[PDB]
Design a protein around this nucleic acid. Structure first.
Lengths: 302, 247, 177, 302
DNA sequence: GGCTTTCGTCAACCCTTTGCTTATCTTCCCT
């Protein structure tokens, strides 16, 4: 009687950001874009470490990739292209029964709120991760379908109602609940100040030889699409004891805090999609969490 | 007095890289000798030897494992199991840009020879791989030995196969002298008494275990004698070079 | 015990072979024992339905014990008994199947022979052991039977890490020159 | 009476496509072909497997081959050729009794619809699964016998009537129903956008180093030839409860979705093949299905 | 009397992480 999930049931991602190239502009000269180059500086400090206090007096030489604004341009510009694709319910590897019953159990999902939180995370500048601190104003210009949309002051921890994010999110929800696609050409102008140090994505490297190795595209400082995609889907205010929005994982798990906000207490995604497939009526934000997982994608089987 | 037709840059993809049970990679000289006798059958131009070189060749997969092929449910009677994934028998696939040079003897103009080889190659299949592209074949003749080297250097750039022979066995010398092993032919084990499940009922059939020789890759210009790169069907149910063992 | 094992093998399908098309296709089941290639260090393969057979006190099937210390050549030359030679040879048969196997034409002089290439078992087992022993890493590794190789072959059942075959990639030509 | 099938009856592949080399061009300069290079990135995420709530908290590091457009070209170009080969009834392993009576029951196959669906799968962009979505405008340029056609907007899930694909299908059906060969050089111009991620073939390979390993050809992103061969034969809209075209399989089996649409309901290739041989009046659509299987080829064990 | 479907049967690893080669070039001479 229990409809088990397919062993290879997987969903493709539906929010596809590009790698976010960072340029340097002014708050006035936004047409003068010079690429933020990744430099490499050798930096000496103290050994630190929680243990081993005997070698505290010894130095610490580490070679670190840095990325800074030049001292003639005070604004950091971040360019990326977010592609919201539709058909979020057609599993590319699990189409059949389970997948399709999840679709019919998720037809009345509030796609407007999911699209609103996605477009707000793009619009409030959450895709800027550590660049936002020290920025005097973060101006987001989202060009949808040749549609300039300017945002100036949006607080990030809560999704306050405005008309421009909702205006973009109307057709973003029309794409997500239906078919087709929409492309958001996103530019972030941040008055970080003269010569402020910007924070790109850092590569994962195991061969070492360099302590911090920033993500670069032909040398220009850039951000990983995955970081932007994590920040776009940071919409999950529906876990147990929800204080801040977290990214949408199947387990509600962020790995910096070393916790899982939705595992071990029967609101991880697999339990909810098993309930929704097996005719257990989810609540509204429950369906929004499951549909946000399907928009994020992943594989849910075995 | 020798005549050759060269097809340069034969981009072929989907090559059955499984040369044998213990060799996966470049197709052996039995494959290209089979291609030569295939045109001896379809086009009628009877081919003595073929010298083949590899411009490009990548086996699909990692550096230690080949990419297996997702099998399709094509056998009869296993319906019901067709919804699940088909079981995978090992057949590595590869892509390869080759340069082929066929020893032919021809008595007509070079244009109809080029057209016949082109019409064969348009319907040919290098090692089970679809011929993606190929340059227009050109005829060159080896009147003397300097002319033989002219034909040799007309296959530039390609890495041809030269035979270096078996000292003791295949594994030992592949580690020791570091040469590559490939199928130079087959060894007949038993006569086959059941011709019902075969291509022909009248052609005599034998179960075979592939014999191997040890070979090296040398660029065609660095090969001193072009006869050491031209593989042909020897009368030991094997293939062999005209120049013998490369020294 | 060894006779116990040879007879355990014989109550079952009972095939000992040096060449087979079972490695090419697991659905094939053609097993061929060539007599001329049996030597001192000739590794020898055997087949049972689903690789069945009892183990000894050290936890080995017949495939381990017949393949170390040249034990198959010892039974083959009859240092352990001529009635054991008979038992061994009762399992050493040539079973033939050409379905799901490659069939090519090889020129034999003014005519062609349809050769069905089946892989040498000694080449697979001894090559895997030697090229892992002699540190030859210009190779590919392939698990033959699939997810559970006991339906294929006793060597595929026991050597689950995969067989070593030669990486036969040629050197590339650099385009920028 | 009751002419049985051969045990190892086999047919050769008649639609032979080449590997789809991926290049980067502009919609303006579509002659600026630039090999999309398969890059290798390393990915930090959260491990979220059906049975992993205990390990959800910890991270998950995967090295993955990616392939993205460069940020100066907004168009993905796809290169392949498709060679349609005649003699679709000449079995190379099956005997001359079952295969010839199979053939003489199949001259009444309307090859025009088969060729129309083959060239429409070529032209609509069916060979471009995950990168035809998110494309602003697709454009297929088919060159055959020094004559060139262009297709802008062809919906891929149904075969609507247009004179250009039918005009190519005239010579493709002439080759398939007759002799010889024909070759269509296909140029896919897909306006994905600036730096949009492209989707080459992933490989079925045991790779300890790379969790996801893409298919490259000299590093250049490429797609598998049998992948495009699966795309071209995705014409089967004639199975039981037919909604979407599936690939022409002997059992109508998509193992990707875990469902075989022609297995068990007496509409697979073997039952219709025996009905065609043994004089049972085969329907037109089953006739075209059996002919499409013979065009695809395969060995048939039984 | 096969014959075709589905369920039961039988298993168990020690792995290693780039080169293979390495490109087709001017002396005499007289017109």
């Amino acid at each position: 009687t229990k409809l088990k999930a397919p062993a290879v049931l997987a969903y493709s991602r539906k929010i596809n950001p590009t790698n976010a190239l960072m340029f340097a502009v002014n708050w006035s000269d936004r047409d003068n874009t010079t690429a933020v180059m990744v430099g490499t500086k050798t930096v000496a400090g103290t050994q630190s470490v929680r243990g081993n206090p005997n070698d505290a007096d010894k130095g610490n030489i580490q070679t670190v990739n840095f990325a800074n604004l030049p001292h003639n341009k005070n604004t950091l510009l971040v360019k990326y292209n977010v592609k919201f694709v539709g058909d979020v319910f057609k599993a590319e590897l699990g189409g059949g029964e389970y997948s399709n019953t999840l679709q019919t159990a998720l037809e009345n999902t509030d796609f407007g709120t999911l699209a609103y939180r996605y477009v707000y995370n793009i619009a409030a500048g959450r895709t800027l991760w550590r660049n936002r601190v020290g920025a005097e104003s973060i101006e987001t210009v989202i060009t949808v379908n040749d549609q300039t949309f300017t945002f100036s002051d949006l607080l990030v921890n809560e999704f306050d109602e405005d008309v421009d994010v909702a205006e973009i999110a109307d057709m973003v929800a029309g794409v997500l609940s239906g078919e087709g696609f929409v492309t958001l050409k996103v530019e972030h102008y941040m008055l970080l100040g003269e010569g402020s140090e910007v924070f790109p994505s850092q590569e994962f490297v195991e061969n070492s030889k360099l302590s911090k190795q920033l993500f670069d595209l032909n040398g220009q400082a850039a951000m990983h699409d995955q970081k932007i995609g994590n920040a776009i889907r940071t919409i999950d205010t529906w876990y147990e004891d929800a204080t801040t929005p977290i990214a949408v994982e199947p387990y509600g798990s962020v790995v910096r805090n070393g916790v899982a906000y939705r595992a071990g207490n029967k609101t991880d995604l697999f339990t909810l999609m098993d309930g929704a497939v097996n005719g257990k009526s989810l609540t509204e934000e429950d369906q929004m969490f499951v549909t946000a997982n399907l928009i994020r994608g992943g594989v849910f089987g075995g | 007095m020798r005549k050759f037709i060269i097809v340069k840059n034969v981009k072929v993809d989907g090559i059955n890289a499984k040369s044998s049970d213990i060799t996966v990679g470049m197709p052996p000289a039995t494959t290209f000798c089979g291609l030569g006798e295939t045109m001896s059958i379809k086009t009628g131009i009877v081919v003595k030897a073929v010298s083949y070189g590899s411009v490009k060749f990548e086996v699909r997969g990692s550096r230690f494992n080949t990419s297996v092929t997702k099998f399709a449910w094509q056998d009869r009677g296993n319906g019901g199991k067709a919804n699940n994934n088909s079981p995978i028998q090992p057949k590595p696939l590869a892509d390869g840009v080759f340069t082929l040079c066929f020893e032919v003897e021809w008595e007509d103009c070079a244009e109809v020879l080029v057209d016949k080889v082109t019409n064969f190659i348009n319907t040919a299949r290098i090692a089970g791989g679809t011929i993606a592209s190929f340059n227009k074949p050109f005829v060159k003749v080896a009147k003397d030995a300097e002319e033989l080297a002219s034909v040799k250097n007309a296959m530039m750039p390609c890495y041809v196969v030269v035979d270096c022979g078996v000292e003791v066995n295949i594994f030992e010398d592949a580690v020791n002298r570091k040469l590559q092993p490939m199928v130079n032919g087959y060894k007949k084990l038993e006569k086959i008494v059941d011709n019902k499940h075969m291509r022909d009922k009248f052609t005599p059939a034998y179960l075979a275990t592939p014999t191997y020789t040890m070979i090296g890759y040398k660029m065609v210009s660095n090969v001193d004698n072009f006869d050491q790169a031209l593989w042909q069907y020897g009368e030991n149910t094997k293939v062999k070079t005209i120049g013998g063992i490369y020294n | 015990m060894i006779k116990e094992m040879i007879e355990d093998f014989i109550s079952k399908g009972g095939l000992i072979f040096t060449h087979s098309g079972r490695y090419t296709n697991t659905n094939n089941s053609c097993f061929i024992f060539n007599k001329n290639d049996i030597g001192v260090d000739t590794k020898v393969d055997m087949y049972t339905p689903k690789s069945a057979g009892i183990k000894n006190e050290e936890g080995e099937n017949l495939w381990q014990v017949l393949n170390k210390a040249n034990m198959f050549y010892r039974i083959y030359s009859g240092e352990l008994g001529e009635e054991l030679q008979y038992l061994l040879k009762s399992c050493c048969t040539a079973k033939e199947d050409v379905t799901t196997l490659p069939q090519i034409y090889f020129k034999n002089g003014e005519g062609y022979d349809i050769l069905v290439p089946i892989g040498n078992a000694h080449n697979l087992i001894s090559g895997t052991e030697y090229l892992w022993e002699h540190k030859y890493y210009n190779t590919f590794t392939q698990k033959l039977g699939g997810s559970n190789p006991q339906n294929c072959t006793h060597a595929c059942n026991k050597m689950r890490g995969g067989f070593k075959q030669f990486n036969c990639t040629p050197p590339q030509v650099e385009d920028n020159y």
